[PDB]
C-alpha cells in the first residue's frame, strides 16, 4: 500500500 501512501504524503503530507 505504501506505494501510494509514500509518494503521496512525500509531496502532499
From Swiss-Prot:
Q: Where is this region: Interaction with ARF1 and IL1B?
A: 2-13
The residue ranges for the Cytoplasmic side of the membrane come to 2-13
Q: Where is this motif: COPII vesicle coat-binding?
A: 5-6
Region annotated Interaction with COPG1 sits at: 2-13
Q: Where in the cell is it found?
A: Endoplasmic reticulum membrane; Endoplasmic reticulum-Golgi intermediate compartment membrane; Golgi apparatus membrane; Golgi apparatus, cis-Golgi network membrane
Motif COPI vesicle coat-binding — list its residue ranges: 5-13
Notes on the domains: The GOLD domain is required for proper p24 heterooligomeric complex formation and efficient transport of GPI-anchored proteins. The lumenal domain mediates localization to the plasma membrane by partially overriding the ER retention by the cytoplasmic domain.
Family per similarity comment = Belongs to the EMP24/GP25L family.
What additional remark is attached to this entry?
A: Ectopic expression of TMED10 alone does not result in its proper cis-Golgi network localization. Interaction of TMED10 with TMED2 is both necessary and sufficient for transport of the couple to the cis-Golgi network, and TMED3 and/or TMED9 contribute to facilitating the process.
Q: What does this protein do?
A: Cargo receptor involved in protein vesicular trafficking and quality control in the endoplasmic reticulum (ER) and Golgi. The p24 protein family is a group of transmembrane proteins that bind coat protein complex I/COPI and coat protein complex II/COPII involved in vesicular trafficking between the membranes. Acts at the lumenal side for incorporation of secretory cargo molecules into transport vesicles and involved in vesicle coat formation at the cytoplasmic side.
Subunit structure as annotated in this protein's UniProt entry: Predominantly dimeric and to a lesser extent monomeric in the ER. Monomer and dimer in ERGIC and cis-Golgi network. Forms homooligomer (via GOLD domain); the assembly is promoted by direct binding with leaderless cargos and may form a protein channel that facilitates cargo entry into the ERGIC. Forms heterooligomeric complexes with other members of the p24 family such as TMED2, TMED7 and TMED9.
Q: What is this protein called?
A: Transmembrane emp24 domain-containing protein 10
Organism of origin is Oryctolagus cuniculus
Gene symbol of the encoding locus: TMED10
Give the shown range, full length included: 208 to 219 of 219
Amino acid at each position: 500500500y505504501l506505494r501510494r501512501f509514500f509518494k503521496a504524503k512525500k509531496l502532499i503530507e
